[PDB]
Design a protein around this ligand. Sequence first.
Ligand SMILES: [Cl-]
Ligand SMILES: [Cl-]
Ligand SMILES: [Cl-]
Ligand SMILES: [Cl-]
Lengths: 161, 160, 161, 160, 161, 160, 161, 160
Amino acid sequence: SAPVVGIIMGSQSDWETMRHADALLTELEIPHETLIVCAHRTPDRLADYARTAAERGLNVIIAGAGGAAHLPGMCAAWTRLPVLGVPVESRALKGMDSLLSIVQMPGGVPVGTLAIGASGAKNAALLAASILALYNPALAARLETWRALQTASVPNSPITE
Amino acid sequence: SAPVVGIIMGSQSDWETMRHADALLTELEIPHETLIVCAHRTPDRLADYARTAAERGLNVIIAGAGGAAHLPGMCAAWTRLPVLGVPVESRALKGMDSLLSIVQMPGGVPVGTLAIGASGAKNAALLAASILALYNPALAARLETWRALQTASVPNSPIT
Amino acid sequence: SAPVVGIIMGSQSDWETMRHADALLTELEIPHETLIVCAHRTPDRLADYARTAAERGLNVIIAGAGGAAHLPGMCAAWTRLPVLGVPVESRALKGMDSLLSIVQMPGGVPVGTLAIGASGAKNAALLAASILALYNPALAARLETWRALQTASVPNSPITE
Amino acid sequence: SAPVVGIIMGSQSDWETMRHADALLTELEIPHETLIVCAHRTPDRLADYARTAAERGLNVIIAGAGGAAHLPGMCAAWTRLPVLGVPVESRALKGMDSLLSIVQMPGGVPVGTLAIGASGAKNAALLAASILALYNPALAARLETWRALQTASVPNSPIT
Amino acid sequence: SAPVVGIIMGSQSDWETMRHADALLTELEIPHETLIVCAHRTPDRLADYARTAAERGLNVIIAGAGGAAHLPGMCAAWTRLPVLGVPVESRALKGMDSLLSIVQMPGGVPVGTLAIGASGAKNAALLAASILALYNPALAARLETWRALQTASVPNSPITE
Amino acid sequence: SAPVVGIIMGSQSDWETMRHADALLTELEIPHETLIVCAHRTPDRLADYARTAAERGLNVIIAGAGGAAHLPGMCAAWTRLPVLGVPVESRALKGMDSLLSIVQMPGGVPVGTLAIGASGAKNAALLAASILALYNPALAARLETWRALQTASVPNSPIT
Amino acid sequence: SAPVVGIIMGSQSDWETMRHADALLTELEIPHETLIVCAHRTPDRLADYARTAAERGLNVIIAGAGGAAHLPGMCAAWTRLPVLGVPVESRALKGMDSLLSIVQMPGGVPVGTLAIGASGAKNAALLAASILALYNPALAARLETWRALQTASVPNSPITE
Amino acid sequence: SAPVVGIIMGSQSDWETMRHADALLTELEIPHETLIVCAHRTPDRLADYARTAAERGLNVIIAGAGGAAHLPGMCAAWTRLPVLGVPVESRALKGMDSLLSIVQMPGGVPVGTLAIGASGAKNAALLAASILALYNPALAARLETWRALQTASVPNSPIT
Ligand SMILES: [Cl-]
Ligand SMILES: [Cl-]
Ligand SMILES: [Cl-]
Ligand SMILES: [Cl-]
């Protein structure tokens, strides 16, 4: 029941995107926590969250942010855990500022970055699941079933009417 | 000594970038294989490589490509393993084509994407290490040392 | 009656764009098939479709995809037929990710790329028609008539009221 | 020995790029002509070239241009033949201006667009070959060989 | 009464933008003609329009186009008159394809390019007026009055209520 | 011999670009002046230059600037003369900042914008010439000759 | 009561953005003036405003503009005061033209640039406040309280219902 | 001689850019400190530096970073002082990643951002000077002289 993934985001406005990560983890029966951590308004909260994540039993952090999106990178600065970053779509620049701010981490401090928006949030959860599946056989079986069903469920032709 | 990370790239020209991933894994003593697999020129080679990766004992795949960079995404299509993608810098568009081709995966098939170029290759290896460290205590300790040395080695002032 | 063009796309959401290719082929009386083939969820379906296209009698493949748009390029990897790619407009990046993912094929494996969106789909069908017209006199005459009528139908002045 | 593909470009400076199309067609023994035609400096030359291409026996036109790259689109305006466009890399904008000027054709007048630069020129020639192969069995066999050799020649591992 | 400026555009859809050029010329009492000329569907119409513009008494051409916007550049290829180009906003790429397709004319064949959209159309007309004013004293006086009034009409403070 | 075109630029570094405008005007025997005027470092110099241009007998101003390129727009703010703007290629952003800063003028104050770099400088001079040709028959004839020679001099095939 | 910050913008349309700077200054009890100054239509008004700002007692200028956004840079050309620039979002290019036109000032004439849009306007006011706080103890205390409250007010978790 | 401006940067490689800020402050005789602080490799060093800056007597912080450039924003998160950000030019994306990562701060935590590269570093120092000049009359006079000399030194015509 203890969380093994932490989903963090800077604002309530990010939840519309990050809820897709939350939903997927629940679907795959991966215990997790969901929190707001703002890199710019609560930097000490971030430092403490990231520093202590491993000792609290977290294995993966999924962090979403938009604009000058510093939350994933600063999380990775303080934790040795894998950090996955979700660029949240921004109003003016459509998430391009979010994307570049997250993915372009200089060498030495990684953030595994997913697509802009809801797709990225879903895939961050799936990527987290595939990491956890490496050392959890029951989850690995659930993930295999999930991927197989996704493949089997693709229609053969469009509805052209 | 059986590999647990696979590093794959589309061509010899990608090696100038992907060698940084190889060097990092060797530094952390993570057994790995380093191969050329081209999504466009050797698609069947890719299918076989990705489909069999898990049964061969690989845990993570690091895939580098430039331009219309399809290697990481198509690898992820055939494996349940985590796939990490490195956008190789392209001549004209400086890896922006590489980056968008890799990171903008549809929901359902993830690629964890790193920075354009050598930084991304180094970070893909470190991210692979941080994944393996979750279930390998000796490696977790070496990764802790690596990160601690990185932090401690930053100078306090520039040399003028 | 056997199809000589295959129109393929990754999702039902692509049909709003790809239907314009379908309509134009029908207008020019070019027999064709329309299918969903998702490069990422059904990669073996794609491999089989592309590998066997020539022996099935297809002459041209029109492939549409958005985002990390890999369907046209991977189709071309497996077929010796000409493959035409239509970038489908994406939500955040307005099809720029689609366009670059399709057009920037490194040397050795071509995809002839058309404009982002509905215009591109229509033109992929017209380009396919112009290819087929090289060795089909009746179609060449229909295409000539079509192009001539397009030219003759352009108004001389705008409705300025 | 009558040409069936026309390769046209706006200037001598484009030749560094378009020579890759020329070389590929020669390798596949596809008879072709290689000419300079500038949409902006020689518009009447372009009109005549494009309007008469089909009656001269051309089957495909490959057109390369950079910057405000109008040559492929205007060629397509005057011919019913398939026109393939190669964006030549520009000095400032690295061929992004070339690419958008060529690929964003209005519905009704297509240009099949290839990658920026030398890769695009090579691929325009290969795409022209794949078109001609549909109704030339000997060429189809040579193209099959070309693609098979490309696939088989990819090394399995990088040289370190 | 004979036209001294020609306003040309490729489609009726361009009129929503180009009407602002038309309105400004009329305001400044500059006789002009407004026509549809599509570079891609009616290339011979374009060649004839541009070739004969000077002998027909035109002094300036204002050409608007979007997407792969070739109309202004090809007009300039055939006329020695100054050609002013208006990038029409495009759906996916917001006129960036229009802008680059028009402004990036290689050396030897100029197009004086204005802003994307309605502002650009208005300014093309104003630029045309400033060209004509160099050798028409009555128009020069009207343009001076117009510019002076524009300056005098700027409010001193925003309505902040 | 009184100047009828003014070429202005913000710094000596712009001269590598703007010299192409100067050369073209000299070739067409259009009397002109070539000056440094910086919108940011010498704003009063700019105000005076632009406000007095018409009374000094200038007909067209060609203004080149890079980066946050404000020189053409601010020139146009103070003169009723046509102002043509040349985006100078910038180091980092390759003149895209220059281009947008110049071309995106608000309705009411036009700048006729040319291509990034040397091509734009040459074309600003040619556009100035085409404006002057409307009311100078001898110049119109020289411009006709210039354009005819440009067209006739394009080779028919590349040199291999 | 005399103003120590000037907020200037080129048009009434900019007020929807710049009002956020106005509101924040008022919240922090910083006396200020708000004016329209258009760099292109009223360049002499701009020259006079900027030249005389220091002698009028202003300490900081906040200037907002969109498109070819020259107002902040030209203000800085004429004043020795710090000038802060707010890129106003533009219709076609989403404020990217605004941003590059403001931030890319060559060396020698600075404009401190904030984010595109309302966030940038709010932050220009906050940056102005942090400048004034260096030599106004009462304001420094109000700003400290404001920043502390911002930090304390961040929720711990999203509303996930 | 106690520093009133802090110049910080993530690495030695940033010094080629940030030295221009250092030189300008020295020219205006503004006491300052120049340090390496990396947001990603030394985050605790950053937290301590920023949190204590005001109590140490700093008035302005100038922070330079490239790529995913987080140093200025995170500095601003911990200090009430004005923070000025310099986007360092990155290899692939020419500082566009640097620029967007720095300038697009959320409302509530400002970074005053300057141009990409050396120009931005020089201007961050000048902007810091203009801030300090508000409450230091001798410095205000030196800054007036600096700006006056800049203006007066612009040549009237290019050297050909
Ligand atoms: Cl290092
Ligand atoms: Cl090769
Ligand atoms: Cl030449
Ligand atoms: Cl200097």
